[PDB]
Amino acid sequence: VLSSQNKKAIEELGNLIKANAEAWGADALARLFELHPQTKTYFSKFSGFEACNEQVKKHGKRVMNALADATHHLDNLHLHLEDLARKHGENLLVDPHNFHLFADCIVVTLAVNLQAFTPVTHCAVDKFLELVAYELSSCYR
C-alpha cells in the first residue's frame, strides 16, 4: 500500500498535477525521449519528440490526467489502473523497466516546477510512482 505520511502528500499533489497536466506531461515525456531514445520506438505515430510537439502535448496531458486520477484512488489502485495495465502490458508490451525510467523523469519535472520539493515529498512521490509501475506491469504476472 502506501504509508499514512506518504498518502497525505500524494492526495494534495494531485490537485496541482491535474491543473498543469499538459505542460508537465509534455515536459516529462520530452525528458524520457531525450534520456532514453530507445523509448521512441513505442510511439510510431509521433512526428516529433520535443515538448512543443502537439502530439507530445496531447499524450503528456493524458498521462498526467491519469496520474492525478490515481491519487484519488490509492486504496484500490489495482481496480483503477486495470485498463491501462492491459493497454501497456498486453497490447504495447511495455518493458516494466521503462515505467521506472519514466518515474525518475517525472520526479525531475516536479522538482523543476514545484515551489518546494523536500526529501519527504520526493519520498512520497517515489513510492506512489513505484506503486503505479507495479500495477501497470500486472499483465505479466
Partner: protein, 141 residues
C-alpha cells in the same frame, strides 16, 4: 568487470563443451516466455518463438557467434561490441534486457550441467554475462 584466470578457463571450457546454437536457441525461447515483453522487437519471427523454429534458429546462430567473439578476446569485448551496442539501441531494446538473456542462459547451463554447476561455476558464468551486458549497454547514447 573482469574474470579471474580460473573463471576465464571455465568459460572457455564450457564453450568447447556445449552446442553453441542449441543452447543459445533454448535461452532465447526461455527469455521470450519468462519475460514476455522481450518479443516486441522480434517481428521478423512472425510469432514463432520456439527453439525449434527456423527464425529463432537463424537468430540464435547470430547471437552465439557474437558470444564466441567475446570469449575469444575477453579484454576487447567492450570495443568489439561498440557497433552491436549501437545496433540494439537503434532497434529500441532496453539495456536491462541484456541481463535477462544472461539469466535464461545460466538456467540452461544449470539444466545441462546440473549438480556440477556449483556456486563457483555459476559465479564464473554470471561474471561473464555481466561483462557482456556491460559491453552492450556501454555504447548507448
Amino acid at each position: 568487470v573482469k574474470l579471474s584466470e580460473d573463471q576465464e578457463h571455465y568459460i572457455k571450457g564450457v564453450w568447447k563443451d556445449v552446442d553453441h546454437k542449441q543452447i543459445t536457441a533454448k535461452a532465447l525461447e526461455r527469455v521470450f516466455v519468462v519475460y514476455p515483453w522481450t518479443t516486441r522487437l522480434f517481428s521478423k519471427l512472425q510469432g514463432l518463438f520456439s527453439a525449434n523454429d527456423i527464425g529463432v534458429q537463424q537468430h540464435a546462430d547470430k547471437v552465439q557467434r557474437a558470444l564466441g567473439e567475446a570469449i575469444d578476446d575477453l579484454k576487447k569485448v567492450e570495443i568489439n561490441f561498440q557497433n552491436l551496442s549501437g545496433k540494439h539501441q537503434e532497434i529500441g531494446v532496453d539495456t536491462q534486457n541484456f541481463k535477462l538473456l544472461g539469466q535464461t542462459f545460466m538456467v540452461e547451463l544449470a539444466l545441462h550441467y546440473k549438480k556440477t554447476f556449483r556456486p563457483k561455476e555459476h559465479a564464473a558464468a554470471y561474471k561473464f554475462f555481466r561483462l557482456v551486458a556491460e559491453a552492450l549497454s556501454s555504447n548507448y547514447h
